[PDB]
Amino acid sequence: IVKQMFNVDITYKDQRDHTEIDKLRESVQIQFNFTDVNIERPQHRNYSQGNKINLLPNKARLCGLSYSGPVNLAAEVILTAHYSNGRQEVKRASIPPFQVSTFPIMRGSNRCHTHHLSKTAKKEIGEDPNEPGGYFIARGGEWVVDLLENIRFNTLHIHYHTMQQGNNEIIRGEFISQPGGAFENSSQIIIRYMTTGAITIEINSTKFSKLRIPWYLIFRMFGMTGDDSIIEQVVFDLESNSLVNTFMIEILEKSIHVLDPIFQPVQHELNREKIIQFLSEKVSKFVSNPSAYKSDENAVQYLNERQLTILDKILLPHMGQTADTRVRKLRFLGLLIHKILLVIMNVFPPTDRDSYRTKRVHGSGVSLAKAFKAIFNTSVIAPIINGFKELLKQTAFEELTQRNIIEAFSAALSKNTASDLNRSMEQSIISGNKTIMVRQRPIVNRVSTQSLERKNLLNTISALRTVNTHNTTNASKQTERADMMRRVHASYPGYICVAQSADTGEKVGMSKQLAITANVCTAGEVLSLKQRLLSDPAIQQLA
């Protein structure tokens, strides 16, 4: 997460004009990346000036301390100065591995001081010899990160719009695509079939939000502007009549000819560049002037290239993250539209919202990975970002030395923050609430938490084997949904305990328990199996 996903390329445009070179320059490109990160076992300052002696879990519990392991980071910073007349001055600095953060360490994990210690040593260290661990020690209390029940990624979930409120919509199909392992950031695409006949595709990720695009527009953004090719991509054949292909063809025609209010200028346009520009203008921030930038060819080129890179990284990333995989992405998107339109025919029923085949359980690692990426962004990158902006304010760009760069990088992560990765990680562990505000933004915490109530070891083990769906914002409204998600489902046997449930109140069926032999798998070697499948003579590739 720190190396591959946390790359920064931010450009600032000053107004400082106290030197001839300062007037000639109105731009600066801040660019840095980390290639070093390691969490080591918890440490404690015995007398505020010691050598950070080991911190044992009972010391953390007794003294209200946090059993957190320090985070050591090393970053490579590239500062590029941009002037007029095409000049480009670059300042490069390499930062020694520095530490301002600590990450909470689950008891019993390989970074816990009692990971491999003998049971007698645990007995005399103040720990439970027989307990397995799996909990966190934060501010004087023990916390368990539960198994958050999440829908399956890379799966098309199709549900009819049976909410009886705002019924201007018909069936909707969402597809959360993940580029790879658990920790890669997922981009969710939503395909909506409308009453007017339109089929709008909405992509929700970092760079996109609540923006609804007609399907043919996304298709012809990548070339293939011919309607024949798009209809062939959806229905897979325009030459076999059938009864299903007739319906899909006619309704795709209706969607194509529907006039949407927002994308009117580029709806009828067959020029790929114009559509790419329009979407880049609409979706990219920091571009307030819609006419000033157009008179500069290089600004247009920058916007187009950035938008194409974005769409490469955001539209179906699991299909690929390179421009050469865009046509197969179009094939996959046509397949998704075909599946939704098949389901419309009542040919297939909607996805079962409670069937466990389309559900995954994310525990500790995944939930903490997501919370950590958000918190690391907010409490590390933005401090560094503002520190470097102020540093450029204070000092001339070529006048910056190697030592000053490191001072501004490390110091920005120190003042007024000093622990905030640890404190925010602790807050995410303690709360686990399905509505939190980070930097004044209403986000959801996907970390299923639970206080460790040690009524008996059976209670502890059952708590660590608990699967929670954990209703988020826009929770269950008064419908059959609040009943069905609490019923024992026919897919439960063998994985979810059919018997275990709360017998009272709102929690009846809300919290599920793993069966006795059920286990949660980790991510496998996807690359090896994919290579074996591609080398299989019986499988014909997309190409």
């Binding site: 015995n46 007398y47 044992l56």
Partner: peptide, 28 residues
């Protein structure tokens, strides 16, 4: 300073093994 060490668990382990050997008085 003592409150930082006396509540440190390895001191109890170090104390309890000194009591077994008899290097320190059994009580406090």
């Amino acid at each position: 300073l003592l409150t930082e060490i006396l509540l440190d668990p390895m001191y109890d382990y170090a104390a309890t093994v000194a009591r077994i050997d008899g290097s320190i008085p059994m009580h406090k």
